[PDB]
Design a protein around this ligand. Structure first.
Ligand SMILES: Cc1cn([C@H]2C[C@H](O)[C@@H](COP(=O)(O)OP(=O)(O)O[C@@H]3C[C@](C)(N)C(=O)[C@@H](C)O3)O2)c(=O)[nH]c1=O
Ligand SMILES: Nc1ncnc2c1ncn2[C@@H]1O[C@H](CSCC[C@H](N)C(=O)O)[C@@H](O)[C@H]1O
Ligand SMILES: [Zn+2]
Length: 405
């Protein structure tokens, strides 16, 4: 009976994905087979309806000097964030001396556009290796976690921020109340705090359980986000659904009563209520479909082997740690995983220990099948791998169901 991180209410578990490793730790082949593990389980608060994990992994075990995810490895996402930056430049950052703070800037994928507009800005990036990649682009970055105190410090030296933005970061931070206190300290009275994160609605519709892993503490909805803002003096004033990362919502929070919520907020709220998205029964039905997908995927993977078909994976996603460890999938079933990230190549996946090789190594002679872990990048990947499919190689997907095509 863990206490909700937003409100302190009681959290009821609906899904247990068992013992899991750190999702973003990629070991050299000769490293000790010891890994940090934790119990990955998800529940819903009874008071505010926030869906959240039941065990926190300490921040510093996940985010540090060698954290390996590089945002700019995706062309879709480079475009996606450059367009978002231009939109803030045309709307919220038209003053004499605007200021935008990004929480979790990573390699600078969004802030580069703000820096090239000459606008004052600051990225928080506690993972110093990717922080340095953003600094190389001329971005101003602080290697610190955003929380109340570091926000107070930026308020004291730099003044208020017109925009605070976080993408695929806010749902990573169990200490969201501290973040929100920092937002309260730092945001201009007429500013916005905008964040976008994997949306509970899409996870349930797609049964995309690999969206649940150490770094995703919260599975936000419009319902839980509205409650969360309210309990903090903010108000959810816009929502926009996004296709990226398997389905997200971008939430816009403002000081309460400062702006009138768009019709979009009330409409999404009513669709979630109508679909009973956060009801414990809907969430338990999702958990039972997760089990059906495990059972189908392992049966397929085993049949492929019995039929002497070769199988690899494509994309060394954090998400895949859930898949391989919950389903029991290792190198006997999926021999290698191909990935464009240097820091992940010539390493082994967490827990399951499948070797990671450069994507340039996925080439003729192709394997018979590629299990598509980077399924949120399907179009971008398939576009670069038409020869594989032309050769008769096929993709195994497990979202929204197990199928080959
Ligand atoms: C586009 C492309 C990617 N790839 C490779 C690169 C990446 O390792 C991985 C994709 O990881 P991708 O789905 O983006 O994020 P991941 O689940 O890891 O999750 C990471 C961690 C984090 C912050 N917790 C999160 O939520 C998201 C935003 O990022 O796949 C190719 O090989 N070829 C390609 O053409
Ligand atoms: N409290 C916090 N403040 C700011 N960044 C944080 C943080 N906790 C984690 N992070 C950073 O959040 C980043 C998530 S990776 C995704 C970053 C990028 N916005 C994108 O959408 O692709 C990591 O680089 C991690 O170091
Ligand atoms: Zn709660």
């Amino acid at each position: 009976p863990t206490a909700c991180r937003v409100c302190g209410g009681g959290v009821q578990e609906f899904l247990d994905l068992g013992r899991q490793p750190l999702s973003d730790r990629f070991r050299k082949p000769d490293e000790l087979d010891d890994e940090f593990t934790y119990r990955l389980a998800v529940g819903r608060c009874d008071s505010c309806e926030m869906v959240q994990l039941t065990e926190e992994v300490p921040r510093d075990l996940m985010f540090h000097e060698v954290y390996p995810y590089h945002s700019s490895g995706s062309s879709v996402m480079r475009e996606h964030f450059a367009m978002l930056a231009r939109d803030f430049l045309a709307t919220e950052l038209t003053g004499p001396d605007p200021f935008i703070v990004e929480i979790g800037c990573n390699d600078g994928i969004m802030l580069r556009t703000i820096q090239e507009a000459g606008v004052r800005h600051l990225g928080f990036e506690p993972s110093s290796g990717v922080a340095a990649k953003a600094r190389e682009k001329g971005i101003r970055v602080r290697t610190d976690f955003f929380e109340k105190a570091t926000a107070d410090d930026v308020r004291r030296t730099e003044g208020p921020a017109n925009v605070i933005y976080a993408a695929n970061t806010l749902c990573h931070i169990p200490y969201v109340q501290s973040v929100l206190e920092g937002v309260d300290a730092l945001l201009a009275p007429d500013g916005v705090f905008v964040f976008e994160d994997p949306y509970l609605g899409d996870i349930v519709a797609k049964t995309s359980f690999d969206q649940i892993y150490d770094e995703h503490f919260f599975l936000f909805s419009a319902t839980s986000v509205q409650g969360m803002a309210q309990r903090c003096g903010f108000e959810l004033v816009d929502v926009q659904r996004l296709p990226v990362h398997g389905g997200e919502v971008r939430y816009t929070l403002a000081r309460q009563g400062s702006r009138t919520p768009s019709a979009a907020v009330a409409q999404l709220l009513a669709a979630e209520r109508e679909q009973e998205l956060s009801d414990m029964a809907t969430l338990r039905a999702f958990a039972g479909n997760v089990v059906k997908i495990r059972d189908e995927l392992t049966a397929l993977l085993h049949r492929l082997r019995a039929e002497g078909r070769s199988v690899v994976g494509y994309g060394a996603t954090a998400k895949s740690a859930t898949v391989t460890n919950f389903c029991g999938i290792g190198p006997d079933l999926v021999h290698s995983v191909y990935d464009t990230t240097p820091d992940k190549q010539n390493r082994l996946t967490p827990g399951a220990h499948i070797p990671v090789r450069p994507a340039s190594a996925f080439s003729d002679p192709y394997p018979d099948y590629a299990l598509l872990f980077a399924w949120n990048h399907a179009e971008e990947i398939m576009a670069k791998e038409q020869e594989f499919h032309q050769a008769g190689g096929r993709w195994i997907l497990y979202v929204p169901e197990v199928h080959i095509r």
